[PDB]
Amino acid sequence: ENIEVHMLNKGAEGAMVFEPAYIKANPGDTVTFIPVDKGHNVESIKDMIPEGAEKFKSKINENYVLTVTQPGAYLVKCTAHYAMGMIALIAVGDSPANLDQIVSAKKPKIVQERLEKVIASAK
Ligand SMILES: [Cu+2]
Structure with missing residues (x-):
């Protein structure tokens, strides 16, 4: 299936x-x-997508279709607004093995606050 963001x-x-x-x-x-x-x-x-998954970067203002193949968690950002908190977490399959690692990884404070909300108040 397809999920629109x-x-x-x-x-x-x-x-x-x-x-x-x-x-x-x-x-x-x-x-x-x-x-x-x-x-x-x-x-x-970097370091926040499953082992075996390919890195990706879309063009600004372009509609982009990502096909997810490897199970695990993926944290993506907007290249421009990352430091302002613009991220999304993609969870493929159940109990993603790398989720606790991603939560602990170094990242801007604003990003960490949103991620924590998305994981709790949006799981
Ligand atoms: Cu942006």
Whole structure:
């Protein structure tokens, strides 16, 4: 199946967000990223995607379709607004082995606060 995500300047959680920011999927599913406001893109974060998965980076303002194959957790960002908190977490399959690692990894404070909310109040 396909899951649609929008990139916006302002959403429910504040400025610069992915909606939804928590995406549950299975291998073979697609995630379609649609920039409803200009200036956004999607890029996998180094050391925060499963072992065996390929890194990716979309073009700004382009609709992008990600096919997820490896199970595990993926943290993605908008290349431009990462430091302002613009991230989404993709959970492929159950009990993603690398989730606790991703939660502990170094990242901007604002990112950490949103991630913690998405994992709790959005799981
Ligand atoms: Cu952005």
